[model samples]
Target chain A: ASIRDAGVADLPGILAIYNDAVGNTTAIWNETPVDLANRQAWFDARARQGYPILVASDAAGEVLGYASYGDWRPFEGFRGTVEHSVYVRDDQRGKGLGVQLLQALIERARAQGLHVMVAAIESGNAASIGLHRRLGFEISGQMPQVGQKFGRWLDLTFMQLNLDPTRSAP
Target chain B: SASIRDAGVADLPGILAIYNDAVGNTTAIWNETPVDLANRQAWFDARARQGYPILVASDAAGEVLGYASYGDWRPFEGFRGTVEHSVYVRDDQRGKGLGVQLLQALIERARAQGLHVMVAAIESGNAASIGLHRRLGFEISGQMPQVGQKFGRWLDLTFMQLNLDPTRSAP
Candidate 1:
């Protein structure tokens, strides 16, 4: 029902959506389900890092979609780049909520002076690929068989969008 | 001066010097600050703990000509089959076979460890490194523009990958 900054209270809602993807979809590669402690720690870490975790909710306050990003590679000089993921609830699959959340996430990234945003998608997901393309992201890497999930090979496709192309220096 | 072998504590100074030079002089590494011996030591210790190889090519005088090592590409469990590696040769030893020798040997070590892919992230303008990887059966997998900076100039990155073996699919 609304798009706002996620808080500590949103962890359980986030956990349910995450576990749904883990148990039923290729959106996440992990096979095991995580406990609330895991989600709590993750939320705290993201909060401490000055990163924004945005979520879309209905009037009843349940998280429908979520988006956030963190340092892409663990290096000092790679700070200007971030890798992000957008997940919509299983039941909310067909709605345009993913686009709304991702669009808001992009604006937040630009506000933070981040130079590039990266999306690493399971390559078989065409709708996700198209969603990014519409937002001006380019397919930079298509690495096949680099990942495995659900007892099958999963290809990873990397798409990137330059946040501020006018500036030359980082 | 012409043989490749395993690296040891004694080679830390050589490796540190080369790494610092790249930090201060070139875009080989995006970091502008030079690190001291302590950083390299920690790195060596971590690699040892992970059972990854750190190989060095030495000269007749027993000086390290170059070093090569492969590290976890991504921390996620799903990326366990891939490794991102780097090869750095002594500045004065350019055009020599040391880089090729060091890289090829590292590839063998990676394959022996049952790895599936090796990635090289080179500065886009670094034709020498890119060409070296190409000749070694690697192909450019991605190119990122203006994602980094050093010396007040934007740096581009080229990701080149080499499939360790086509026969194995699952890790």
Candidate 2:
């Protein structure tokens, strides 16, 4: 029913979606289901960096989807770019939650003066690919056979959005 | 003559010097900030923990002429077999074949560890580095224009990769 910054109370809902992706989807490459503690640490780290973790919730305050980003690559020179992922609960799919969460995340990036946002998706996931393309992201590169999950090789597609291409300089 | 061997604690200063010089004088490294010796030591320690090799090219006099190393291309379990690497020789040591020597040794090490792929993200204009990588069997995979900047000029990134064992089915 609303989109807002995630709080500690939203951790459980966040963990559920993450675990679901780990077990059932190639959206996340990790196979093991992480515990609440692992998710807690991740949440804490995001909060510490002043990064926004936005969640979409129903009127009952149930988290339907979430999106967030962190350093795109490990280097000081890459500080202006971020890599983000969005996940909507299984039952909450096809409700525009992903679009809402991602759009909201982009506004956050712009406000923070971030320059680029990258999204890496499994090559076979056409729906996710379409979602990103519709959101103004351009396919930057395709990495084939670079990743594996569910006992199969999964190609990776990198899509990026230059937050403000005209800004001229970082 | 120079020999290639695993980098040690003592090689940090030499490595730092080469890295800082690249930052200050070349587009090979996009960062304008020159990292301190402590930062290089921390980098060495982290690589050690991951069991990643940091190989140095040392002269007969035992001073580091250059170094090469690789880390995860992307931090995901699925991409475990792929690594993005850096190979740098001293600014004064180029054209003497040190870059090629260091890169050849790097390829041998990567294959020895069963790594599937090795990638290099280089400044597009740096034909020297690009040519060395191409000669070592790397091919251009992607290019991004003006994604980085230093020396008050826009920089472009060229992604090149070598398929270490294209026959390997999976990690």
Candidate 3:
């Protein structure tokens, strides 16, 4: 019902959503379910890097969805850009939680002065692609058969959003 | 170096010099700060750990003239078959076809390793580099604008890809 910053107490909920995505969906290419400790390490790393991990939760504190971002590539040239992911609880989809979580994440990124945000989506995910398009993300690139999961090859579509359009130079 | 070979520990400093030169004087590398020798040493060791090749073009006297290497394109299991590569020739060695020789060898290496794709992320304005990859059977996959920054300016990126094997229908 409301969006807020995620905390250590929310890692279990986050882990649940992540593992669900891993097992049942191509949202995450990983097929193995990760434990709470893995989410803890991930949360700690994001905190250390000053990146936000935001969650949309009900009034009773059930995490309906979550979103976060990190370095787009592990290279100095790409320091100004980040790649992001947003996921909703399997039972909590279609209520516009993804939109709220991603909207909040973009605001956080702009507040931190990030230049670009990249969304690498599965080519077959028209729902996700439409969501990104509605949020002003543009299709930048497409690489066919660049990834594989679920016993088959997968295509990747890269979408990008410039957080600060007015600032001409980085 | 005129001769292309697997890089050795002795080749790091020479590699570092060429790397830092690109960082300083050219838009080839978008980092503002230059890296030290230890960086190259760690990179060399990491390439060894990944079973990836770090190739060098060397002179008869064993000096490094250029280098080429490829690493994981993305940090995910699904992307294991894909790699993004970098091929750099020294400023003075640009027109000698060393890049072609190094890239040709690298393509053969990729084929031997059963890699599915090789990606090149070139700066958008570098027509020479783009032309080089185009001539080597790489096709432009995407053009991204203002995705990077260096030398007080926003940098656009052009992605090129080469499918290593045309015969395999599945991974």
Best lDDT among the predictions, by candidate number:
3
Lowest lDDT 10-mer window, candidate 3 chain A?
Answer: A71-80
Per residue, candidate 2 scores C-alpha lDDT tens digits across A14-97 of 999999999999999989899889988999899898888999998888989899999876666777788999999999889889
Between prediction 1 and prediction 2, the one with superior lDDT is 1
Clashes of each: 4, 2, 5
Candidate 3: TM-score?
0.96
| TM-scores for chain B, listed for all candidates | 0.97, 0.96, 0.98
Clashing pairs in 3: B1-B57, B1-B58, B1-B59, B1-B65, B2-B58
Q: Cα RMSD for candidate 3?
A: 1.4
In angstroms, how far off is A149's CA in candidate 2?
Answer: 1.7
Q: Which ranges of candidate 3 are over 4 A from the true structure?
A: none
The best candidate in terms of DockQ: 3
Can you write out model 3's per-residue Cα lDDT over B11-104, one digit (the tens) per residue? Answer: 9999999999998998887787899999899999999999899999999889899999999998888888899999989999989999999999
Q: Which ten residues in a row have the lowest lDDT in candidate 2 chain B?
A: B145-154
TM-score of each: 0.96, 0.93, 0.96
Write the residue-wise lDDT of candidate 2 on B1-171 in tens digits: 799999999999999999999888988787888999999999999998987899999988899999999888887898887888998889788778988888899899999998888889998898888988888898887676666777776666788888888887765
